[PDB]
Amino acid sequence: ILTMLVEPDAGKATWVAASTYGTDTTTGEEVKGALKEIHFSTYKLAAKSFI
Amino acid sequence: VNQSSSVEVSSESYETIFSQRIIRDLQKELVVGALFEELPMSSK
Amino acid sequence: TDETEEDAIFSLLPLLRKRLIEAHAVSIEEAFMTGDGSGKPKGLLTLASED
User: Fold this and answer.
1) Which chains contact A through at least 3 pairs of Cβ atoms less than 8 Å apart?
2) How far is C1 from chain A (nearest CA, A)?
3) Inter-chain contact B24–A2, Cβ cutoff 8 Å?
4) Alpha-carbon gap, residue C27 to C32, rounded angstroms
5) Contact B17 A4 (CB under 8 A)
6) Which strands, in side-by-side order, build the sheet including A2-6?
7) Fewest CB atoms within 10 A around its CB: which of A34, A35, C7, C13?
8) Distance of residue B12 Cα from the nearest chain A Cα, in angstroms
């Protein structure tokens, strides 16, 4: 198997209002991302001949 | 796994070659972020 | 907040620190007068009532 990593999708940031200043959301919500994994594998093709 | 032969790898993690390559799609071209100029403001 | 500082033509932290030092001076004062004394300094006008 080969398991390369795929980067997660983009995150929007928050537009904070005037009244959340010096508050704790004045820095928005958190952009959480989660790397994901893709797998590569093989199958077999085969043949026989007899002379 | 690959248990075909006498002698087999223990977990299939000793099989896979984990890679550390990261890939991102065509990803929405961001057209309108920079088309317009800036007024560097210094007040509300 | 970072923003008020940017949203003012004037600086605004000189005031904070002054109004800061001042707040402490006033406070010792209000209390040294009539400070009940529970977690505040007891004061000359309540020290008197006590005596």
Assistant:
1) B, C
2) 5
3) no
4) 8
5) no
6) A36-37, A2-6, B17-23
7) A34
8) 8
Q: Residue A24 is encoded by which pair of tokens?
A: 């704790």
Which resolution, in Å, applies to this structure?
A: 3.4
Q: What string of H, E and C letters represents the secondary structure of chain C? A: CHHHHHCCCCCCHHHHHHHHHHHHHHHHHHHHHCCCCCCCCCCHHHHHHHC
CA A42 → CA A2, B3, B5, distances in Å?
10, 16, 18
Chain B partners within 8 Å of A6 (Cβ): 22-24
Give the residue on A whose Cα is nearest the Cα of C4: A21
- Please give the method by which this entry was determined: cryo-EM
Asked whether C44 and C32 are in contact (CB, 8 A), the reply is yes
Angle at B36 between CA B33 and CA B41, to 5 degrees: 100
